[PDB]
Amino acid sequence: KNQYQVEENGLSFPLSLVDDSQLWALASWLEQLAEEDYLISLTDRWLLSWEALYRLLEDEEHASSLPLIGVPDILPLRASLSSRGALSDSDFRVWIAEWATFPARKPIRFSRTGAILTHDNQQYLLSRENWALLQATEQLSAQQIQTPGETTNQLGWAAIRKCAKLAAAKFDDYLEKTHVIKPTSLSLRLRKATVADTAVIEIEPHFEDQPANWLGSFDKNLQVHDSYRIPGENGELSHVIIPPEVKEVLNSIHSIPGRRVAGSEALSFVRNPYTFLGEDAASVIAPEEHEQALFDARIFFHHFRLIPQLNTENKITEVTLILEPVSPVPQPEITFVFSAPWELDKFIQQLGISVAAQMPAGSWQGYELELSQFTEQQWHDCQALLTRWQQEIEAEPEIPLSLKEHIRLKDHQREGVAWLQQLFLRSPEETAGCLLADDMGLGKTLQILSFLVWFIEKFPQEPPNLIVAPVSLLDNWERELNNFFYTAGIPVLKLYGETIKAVKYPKQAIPAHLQSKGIKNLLKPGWQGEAKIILTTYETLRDQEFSLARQPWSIMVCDEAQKIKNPAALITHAANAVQARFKVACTGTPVENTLVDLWSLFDFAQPGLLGALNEFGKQYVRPIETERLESLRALIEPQTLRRTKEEVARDLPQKIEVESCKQLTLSGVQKQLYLSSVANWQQQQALGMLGLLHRLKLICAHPAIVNPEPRFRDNSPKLNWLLKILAEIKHTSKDKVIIFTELRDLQRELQHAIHQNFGFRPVIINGDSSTKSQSQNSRQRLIDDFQAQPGFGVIILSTVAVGFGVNVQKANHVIHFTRCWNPAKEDQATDRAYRIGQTKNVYVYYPTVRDTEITTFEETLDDLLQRRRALARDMLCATPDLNCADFETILKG
Numbered sequence: 001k002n003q004y005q006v007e008e009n010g011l012s013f014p015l016s017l018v019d020d021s022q023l024w025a026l027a028s029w030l031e032q033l034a035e036e037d038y039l040i041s042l043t044d045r046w047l048l049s050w051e052a053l054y055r056l057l058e059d060e061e062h063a064s065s066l067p068l069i070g071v072p073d074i075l076p077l078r079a080s081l082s083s084r085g086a087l088s089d090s091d092f093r094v095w096i097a098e099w100a101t102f103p104a105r106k107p108i109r110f111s112r113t114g115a116i117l118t119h120d121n122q123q124y125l126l127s128r129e130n131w132a133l134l135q136a137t138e139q140l141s142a143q144q145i146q147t148p149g150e151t152t153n154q155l156g157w158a159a160i161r162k163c164a165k166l167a168a169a170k171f172d173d174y175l176e177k178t179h180v181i182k183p184t185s186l187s188l189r190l191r192k193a194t195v196a197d198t199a200v201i202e203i204e205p206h207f208e209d210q211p212a213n214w215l216g217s218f219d220k221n222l223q224v225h226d227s228y229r230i231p232g233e234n235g236e237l238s239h240v241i242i243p244p245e246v247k248e249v250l251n252s253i254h255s256i257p258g259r260r261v262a263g264s265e266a267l268s269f270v271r272n273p274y275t276f277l278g279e280d281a282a283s284v285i286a287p288e289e290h291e292q293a294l295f296d297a298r299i300f301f302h303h304f305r306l307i308p309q310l311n312t313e314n315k316i317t318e319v320t321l322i323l324e325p326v327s328p329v330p331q332p333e334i335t336f337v338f339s340a341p342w343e344l345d346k347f348i349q350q351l352g353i354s355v356a357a358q359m360p361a362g363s364w365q366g367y368e369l370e371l372s373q374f375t376e377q378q379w380h381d382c383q384a385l386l387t388r389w390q391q392e393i394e395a396e397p398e399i400p401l402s403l404k405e406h407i408r409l410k411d412h413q414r415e416g417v418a419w420l421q422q423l424f425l426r427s428p429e430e431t432a433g434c435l436l437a438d439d440m441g442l443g444k445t446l447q448i449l450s451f452l453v454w455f456i457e458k459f460p461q462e463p464p465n466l467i468v469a470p471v472s473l474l475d476n477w478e479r480e481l482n483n484f485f486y487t488a489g490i491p492v493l494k495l496y497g498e499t500i501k502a503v504k505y506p507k508q509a510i511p512a513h514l515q516s517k518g519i520k521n522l523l524k525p526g527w528q529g530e531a532k533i534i535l536t537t538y539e540t541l542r543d544q545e546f547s548l549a550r551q552p553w554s555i556m557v558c559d560e561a562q563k564i565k566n567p568a569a570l571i572t573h574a575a576n577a578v579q580a581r582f583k584v585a586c587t588g589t590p591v592e593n594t595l596v597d598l599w600s601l602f603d604f605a606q607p608g609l610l611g612a613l614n615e616f617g618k619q620y621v622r623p624i625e626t627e628r629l630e631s632l633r634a635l636i637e638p639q640t641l642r643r644t645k646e647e648v649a650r651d652l653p654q655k656i657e658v659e660s661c662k663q664l665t666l667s668g669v670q671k672q673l674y675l676s677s678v679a680n681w682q683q684q685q686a687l688g689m690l691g692l693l694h695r696l697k698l699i700c701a702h703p704a705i706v707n708p709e710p711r712f713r714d715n716s717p718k719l720n721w722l723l724k725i726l727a728e729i730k731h732t733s734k735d736k737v738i739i740f741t742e743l744r745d746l747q748r749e750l751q752h753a754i755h756q757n758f759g760f761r762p763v764i765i766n767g768d769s770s771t772k773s774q775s776q777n778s779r780q781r782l783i784d785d786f787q788a789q790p791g792f793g794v795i796i797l798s799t800v801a802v803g804f805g806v807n808v809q810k811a812n813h814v815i816h817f818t819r820c821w822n823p824a825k826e827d828q829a830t831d832r833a834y835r836i837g838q839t840k841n842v843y844v845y846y847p848t849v850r851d852t853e854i855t856t857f858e859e860t861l862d863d864l865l866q867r868r869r870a871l872a873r874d875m876l877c878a879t880p881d882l883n884c885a886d887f888e889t890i891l892k893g
C-alpha cells in the first residue's frame, strides 16, 4: 500500500495522517517537508510536486527519511525523438517516438501519471532528465496549439534539444541535422595579445553549445542579431536565438573594435562589466567565472608608486615605477626605471587619458593600472613631479539625541561608540578607517548606528553615509534604525530592490558622452535625495560601482566584511573604489582562511597600514603559514576593536555549561554496537571515514536509529537524560527548552519521545529565514507561537536553521543533542537564547556519552570542539571545520 495518491502534478499526501498515531513518523516527516518548502498545501492534502520530488531524492539530509513514503525506483530509460516537417512549417511537431531500457535498448510501453510510470503492475519513476525532456515536448505541443509559427517551433525545440542532450535522447535524421541554441549565460574568454604597439586583450564570447562558425557571423555583422542562422560544415544548419539580457552583453562585446581591449573604457569593461551593463549581466556572466577568467589571463590591475630618486643637489636622477600586483595570491612586484623625462611623460599621458575618461582601468606597456583609488591629489602630484623634473633638466561617548529614551547602550557599546567617534575625529589625516571585530551578539549594529546618527546630527552638511551588507542584513539594519532611533532627522535610502529602478537612468536617457564609453547602467543625478544613510548590497555595490564612486561619502560601513576577504574580487574592487572619509569593516571573523583576509580588510579600512600584499605575505603569512602574530596584533591594535562575549559577560545573562550532562555512559548494547561498527569499518578498509564518523554519531546519539532492535530502543542514555532533565525543568521552573539537532530522523524520534512523556509535540524547524516569506513567515509564526505559549515548552531547532533575524529569548535551556563540527555554528545556535534581552540564566547542555575503556566519538568531538573554540577566541586565527583526519584517534580504540 502506498501512502500517497498519485496525480498529474505530483504525489499527494492527506492531512489526516497527522491524526493517525501509528503513522507518527510519516506525519512528522511530512510536517518537516512542508516547513522546508518541499510540500504544497492544497485543499486538505499536501502536494509533493515532481520538481520537489526530484530535489528531495537528491537531498542527503532527508535520505534516511525517504523509506517512509517509498518512492518508486527510477527506471533507466532513453528516449527516441521523431518529428515531421521542418521548423518553418506551422504543423511542425516533435514527439518522443519510443522509450527503451538504457543497457538493454528494449522498447517499452508504459502507463504514465505525471512522472510515475506503470510498466506491468509495478510503478516506476522517470529520471529527472527524462522528465524534463517530456515536460519540454509537452510544453512545445501545448504552445503550438496556441501560437503556431516559426518562433514557437524554434524556442520549443531548443528547449527540447537541450533536455535531450541532458537526457541522452536519440534524435531522428532531421532533428540531428537541425540545431537551435538559445544561450542563457555567456562566457568571456580573455587572452592577452600584442596586436597594437603595446599589449592588448582579446574578448571572445562563448556559449554552452556555440556553433563552430557563430563567431565569424557575429563579427561580420554590424549589429548583434536576435537570431543567427549558421550553416554547418557537416551539411547541417545551426540557429542561435539571443535573449535581450544576452543581447546587451553581446552589444557591449561587439562595440569593442575587433574584440581587442585597448583603452580605458574597454579595460574598464573587462575589469567590471556589471557597472557598464547592470544587474542583468550577473545572470548572464557569472562574477566568479569572470574573476577566474581575469586571473587565468594574467590580467591584474596593479597599484603603482612613483619614487623620484634625489641627487646630492636635490635634483631628480631617475623615477622608479613599481607596479604592485593585485590578486589573492601575493606576487612579485614589477619595477620600471624612468631614466628620462619623456618616459614619465608618456606614463603621465596614459594616466591623464584614463582619468579624463573617468575610468578606473588604465594601462601601461602590457600592465593594467587600478585607478579606483588614484585621487585627483595624486594626479596633481604626478604632474608636479613631471614639471619639476623637466624644469631641473631644462573617552566619553557622545550619545545621539535621537536615540529613544528607553534604550540604554551597554558599557561595551558606549566604549565602542566612543572609540569610533575618536577614530573618526582624526579620520581625514591620521586614520582612514577601522575594523570593528566584536563577536556576534554584542550589538555591533547598534554601536555603528549610534556612531552614524551622532555624525549626522553633529555634521548635517557632510556627504551621506553608505552601508553595504547582504539584503538579509540590510533589512535588519533598517529595522534596528527604526527601533532604536527617532527616524525623523535621519532619512534613509535603500538601493536594493525596485528603489534601484526608481533612481536608475532610463536605458536611452544615459548621457551621450557616457554612452560612448559603453555605459548602459547608470543612476540619475540626485538619486541620493535627502537620505543621509544609504543602504545597499555588495552585489549592488559591484553593479553600481561607477555611480557609487562618483560622489564623496562620509562613512562607509561594510557589514560582514568577510565578503571583501579576496583582494581581487570585483566586490572588493568596488568597495575600495568608493571614496569615503571613514571606512568601518564589521565582521566577527576577520580571518577565515588566511591572514590575506585581514590584509584585505585593513587595505579597505586603512590603506597602507599593513603595506603591500607581497610584503605582508613574506612578513606575516609565510612565517606563520608566535612573535609574528604578536607583532601583527600590536600593529592592527590601534584601529581594531575586538571584544568577546567573555569580556562582556556582565552585560549579558549568566551562561551555565552543565557538567552533569557530559558524563553519560555507553550502555552494553550501545558499546557493543559501536565496537562492532568500528571493527567492521577497519576490516573493510584493510581489505570512507566520514561514513564511519556519521554512524558513530548516530550510535552515540540514538542507537535505535542505527538498529531498530528493541534492545537499542530502551538503552539510549542520552534520550533517558533528555527525558529526565525535561521532566525536571517542567516540574521545577516551567522554562522553555531548545534542542539542537540537524538529523531529521533524530528530530522525529526526539519529538515522539517528548510527545509520549509530556503530552505535546515539539515543533521541528529546519529551514532558515531567507527571503522565502511563503514559508519564512510560517517559520517565524511557529517560533512566535512557541515563545508566546505560557509555561513549559520544547522546540527542536537545527543549527543551520538559526541565524539572522531569528532569536528565542523566552527559552533558557539550550540542548545540543548532536554537535556540529564547527564551534562557530554551535556558538551562533546557543546565541539564540544567550543574548541581550535574556532575563534568565542560560543553561547550555552538551550531552556527551563516555566510556571508561573506549574514547567515544562524542568525547573526541567535545575535546576537538573545545580546542577549536579556544583557538577561535583569537581574532587572527582561522576556524576550519573538523574533518575525518581530526578524528583519527577512534581507530586507535
Ligand SMILES: Nc1ncnc2c1ncn2[C@@H]1O[C@H](COP(=O)(O)OP(=O)(O)OP(O)(O)=S)[C@@H](O)[C@H]1O
Residues within 6 Å of the ligand: 407, 408, 409, 410, 413, 438, 439, 440, 441, 442, 443, 444, 445, 446, 559, 586, 835, 836, 837
Ligand atoms: N542597548 C541595547 N538594548 C537593547 N537591545 C540591544 C541593545 N544592544 C543590542 N541589543 C540587541 O541585541 C541583539 C543582538 O545583537 P546583534 O545585532 O544580533 O549582533 P551584532 O553585533 O549586531 O552582529 P551583526 O548584526 O551581524 S553587525 C540585537 O538584535 C539587538 O536587538
